[PDB]
Design a protein around this ligand. Structure first.
Ligand SMILES: *[C@@H]1O[C@H](CO)[C@@H](O[C@@H]2O[C@H](CO)[C@@H](O)[C@H](O)[C@H]2NC(C)=O)[C@H](O)[C@H]1NC(C)=O
Ligand SMILES: *[C@@H]1O[C@H](CO)[C@@H](O)[C@H](O)[C@H]1NC(C)=O
Ligand SMILES: *[C@@H]1O[C@H](CO)[C@@H](O)[C@H](O)[C@H]1NC(C)=O
Ligand SMILES: *[C@@H]1O[C@H](CO)[C@@H](O)[C@H](O)[C@H]1NC(C)=O
Ligand SMILES: *[C@@H]1O[C@H](CO)[C@@H](O)[C@H](O)[C@H]1NC(C)=O
Lengths: 198, 112, 63, 264, 128
């Protein structure tokens, strides 16, 4: 979650129906766009930001939400539009001996900016005594591992979160719907759909 | 192969007097770039030769103003205006226009 | 307070209802006027400031 | 191959009314449009830098703040790009824009940048050509995340103006080339900056560097060079823009510079 | 300014290859034409071979072809020379010389030939 993977989507035509055709996604939550209206729009500035968090922290990946990963690992802007996709990954991202590959920044001095990634592995001074780069009394490492085990129930199983981010109408669109184009007609009263502008 | 002649082989020169050394080439050293390419080197015993002059008259860095060069075509002269105790050694004229690179037999200059 | 931009780019600033110690400085009952000098000579009102005070362009004067 | 090689002096001048750019991607004709954005304030303190090489570390690092207005009357062959980042080493992300005579090439990698970075040109006898080297810009480039090659924007008296903004992940570059009749380098009047390149970067930028081309002597290992460039800083501030009948921003008022401006 | 350094002197039985090195400092070797010269004691000094900016890369003497081979390591910025089939007359002081490949600015540059900077010689001794 502190080193979340950010992928650009551009210069493609997107079929969102195949996401519905095969879907193990338990949480499918879109904020500024209706889920059935993705095929009816053109987009650019499209991103997929992927990380793995806890089952109870999937509510914290939202504009204006409260958490440790919300302010120290990944912050969304208040005018964010897009969709959050959260699904359980107990079959793949969990081990019976304990999957400790996924870490979170528990401690930091100040909150992050929106769409900001922090990978600095520096110590945090949690008390009045300075730590001087050595852990000890009131000195803890910021990056801590999750204790992901498959024997636990839902809500503590590891959940993969992918955040799709867009822009609307302010930029030339490169990701569009699957419709075919129509021939142009001049001087005649028609209703038109130019890149999602109707 | 360009063959050259150095003159004279040994020149006994007194302190302070200018001395002239003639380099003659059997082939014309004009190049397609336009500038003729002659280099004069001075060698001391126990010392590798260093570049005294490049392209007839143009000075190398660290070379004093006591040396002059003149001539063109196939006839070149190197003149030493003042001869001191550091001027003893063997002088060489060489060409860099036509391969292979060939060097003169050298001229030995002493004090007495 | 301005004349026309065809006339000049000089302006005066009226801080309304504010004494001049809490901000060419003149104290009016309307407020504190900055950038206009007070003239004892009286003229017809050109730009109304208030409380009997008016402004005009001649620099910007207040009277 | 990092050497501390370039010295720099600075002076202070007036921005006048430069630094205006188009705030969005919308044509507007014969309107008065008020927008609040990161603008260069009018008549502001703009630092004139003279970067000198003659044949110690005297090239200090400038903060980025909220955005940078960049200007240069000097030609396009010595000044050849910019560096952006926070620490400029392998621990953090780093962004490099390099212009050369055919194209422009942009990286976002983890560059291990030198203290005095410069592109140096030299002749290669195997390639038999004058080629450019970035080995004095940086020592290494690993874990590289972004690459973008496009048509160049430093081509050929000619004042070149750029606006760099770092907003919510995108690095926005605005540019303009204006033929300035011999006189004051920062001229009067309005030259609006068209939106040139919007880069998908998404890194932290608080410090920047400007990249110089240095020539080997072949006659104090580098040929002596000189560069003059103006740097100003953008502020979150409200402008009112005049769009004429051809859609060009021909005039503007900055609202806080003067009370009369605020009335406008 | 180009600085040239050499390797140590050697003595070898005839019939084996000789590895003679010249290391360049101050400049990298890709900007420099590289040449090699022999000097016998009591004789005039003549040429192994050297680089050619145009119409080829490396040129050799006509009497020394087939024995001298020339390598350049760009990573260590070194020039190595190998010479096989040693003879009893090969006891000589070997000089490595260099010069700039071009001259002038990038817009106006001309090809250069010559031997400007010379290094210290290495003594090649062929004996029993
Ligand atoms: C200008 O910069 C570009 C970008 O690096 C150079 O183009 C590359 O040149 C190398 C040669 O080693 C090729 O391997 C790459 O494929 C080229 N990339 C592209 C996108 O063309 C170009 O050579 C530079 N020009 C000069 C004169 O230095
Ligand atoms: C960006 O970098 C600066 C200096 O390196 C630092 O002060 C700032 O905290 C960084 N931003 C974030 C969100 O950490
Ligand atoms: C610009 O700032 C300097 C101090 O950094 C100051 O001395 C100078 O007067 C300023 N310029 C103007 C026009 O106020
Ligand atoms: C960066 O590179 C180093 C060494 O190549 C490697 O150990 C490290 O895992 C890399 N980090 C990332 C995020 O790729
Ligand atoms: C606007 O466009 C017209 C038509 O091309 C041109 O004649 C005119 O010079 C342009 N500029 C202004 C300021 O009208």
């Amino acid at each position: 979650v502190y080193a979340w993977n950010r992928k650009r989507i551009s210069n493609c035509v997107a079929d969102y129906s195949v996401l519905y055709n095969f879907a193990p996604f338990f949480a499918f939550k879109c904020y500024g766009v209706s889920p059935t209206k993705l095929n009816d729009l053109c987009f650019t500035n499209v991103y997929a930001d992927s990380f793995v968090i806890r089952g109870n922290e999937v509510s914290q990946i939202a504009p204006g939400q409260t958490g440790n990963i919300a302010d120290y690992n990944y912050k969304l802007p208040d005018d964010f539009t897009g969709c959050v996709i959260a699904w359980n990954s107990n079959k793949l991202d969990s081990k019976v001996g304990g999957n400790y590959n996924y870490l979170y920044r528990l401690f930091r001095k100040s909150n992050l900016k929106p769409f900001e990634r922090d990978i600095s592995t520096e110590i945090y001074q949690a008390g009045n005594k300075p730590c001087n780069g050595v852990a000890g009394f009131n000195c803890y490492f910021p990056l801590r591992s999750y204790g992901f085990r498959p024997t636990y129930g839902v809500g503590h199983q590891p959940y993969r979160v992918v955040v799709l981010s867009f822009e609307l109408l302010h930029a030339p669109a490169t990701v569009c719907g699957p419709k075919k184009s129509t021939n142009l007609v001049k001087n005649k009263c028609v209703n038109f759909n130019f890149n999602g502008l109707t | 192969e360009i063959v050259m002649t150095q003159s004279p082989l040994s020149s006994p020169v007194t302190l302070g007097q200018p001395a002239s050394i003639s380099c003659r080439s059997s082939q014309s050293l004009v190049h397609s770039d336009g500038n003729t390419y002659l280099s004069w080197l001075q060698q001391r015993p126990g010392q590798p030769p260093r570049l005294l002059i490049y392209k007839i008259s143009n000075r190398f860095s660290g070379v004093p103003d006591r040396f002059s060069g003149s001539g063109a075509g196939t006839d070149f002269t190197l003149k030493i205006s003042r001869v001191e105790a550091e001027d003893v050694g063997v002088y060489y004229c060489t060409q860099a226009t036509q391969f292979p690179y060939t060097f003169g037999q050298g001229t030995k200059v002493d004090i007495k | 307070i301005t004349p026309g931009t065809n006339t000049s780019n000089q302006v005066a600033v009226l801080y309304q209802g504010v004494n001049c110690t809490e901000v060419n400085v003149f104290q009016t009952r309307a407020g504190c006027l900055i950038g206009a000098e007070y003239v004892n000579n009286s003229y017809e009102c050109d730009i109304p400031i208030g409380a009997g005070i008016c402004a005009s362009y001649q620099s910007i004067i207040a009277y | 191959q990092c050497v501390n090689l370039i010295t720099r002096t600075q002076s202070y001048t007036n921005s006048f009314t430069r630094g205006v750019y188009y705030p969005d991607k919308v044509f507007r004709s014969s309107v008065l449009h008020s927008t609040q954005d990161l603008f260069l304030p009018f008549f502001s303190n703009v630092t004139w830098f003279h970067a000198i090489h003659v044949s110690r570390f005297d090239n200090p690092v400038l903060p980025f703040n909220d955005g940078v207005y960049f200007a240069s009357t000097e030609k396009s062959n010595i000044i050849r790009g910019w560096i952006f980042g926070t620490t400029l080493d392998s621990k953090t992300q780093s962004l490099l824009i390099v212009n050369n005579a055919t194209n422009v090439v942009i990286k976002v990698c983890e560059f291990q940048f030198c203290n005095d970075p410069f592109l140096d040109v030299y002749y290669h006898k195997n390639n038999k050509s004058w080629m450019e080297s970035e080995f004095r810009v940086y020592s290494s480039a690993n874990n590289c995340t972004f690459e973008y090659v496009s048509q160049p924007f430093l081509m050929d008296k000619n004042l070149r103006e750029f606006v760099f903004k770092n907003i919510d992940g995108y690095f926005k570059i605005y540019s303009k080339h204006t033929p300035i009749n011999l006189g004051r380098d920062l001229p009067q009047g309005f030259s609006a900056l068209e939106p040139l390149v919007d880069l998908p970067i998404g890194i932290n930028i608080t410090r920047f560097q400007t990249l110089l081309a240095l020539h080997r002597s072949y006659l104090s290992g580098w040929t002596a060079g000189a560069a003059a460039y103006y740097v100003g800083y953008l502020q979150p501030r409200t402008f009112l823009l005049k769009y004429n009948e051809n859609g060009t921003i021909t005039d503007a008022v900055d609202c806080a510079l003067d009370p009369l401006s605020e009335t406008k | 300014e180009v600085q040239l350094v050499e390797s140590g002197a050697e003595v070898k039985k005839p019939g084996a290859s000789v590895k003679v090195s010249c290391k360049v400092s101050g400049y990298t070797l890709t900007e420099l034409s590289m040449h090699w010269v022999r000097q016998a004691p009591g004789k005039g000094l003549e040429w192994m071979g050297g680089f050619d900016p145009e119409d080829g890369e490396t040129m050799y003497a006509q009497k020394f072809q087939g024995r001298v081979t020339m390598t350049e390591d760009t990573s260590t910025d070194t020039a190595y020379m190998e010479l096989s089939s040693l003879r009893s007359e090969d006891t000589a002081v070997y000089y490595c010389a260099t010069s700039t490949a071009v001259a002038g600015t990038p817009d106006l540059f001309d090809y250069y030939y010559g031997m400007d900077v010379w290094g210290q010689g290495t003594t090649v001794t062929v004996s029993s």
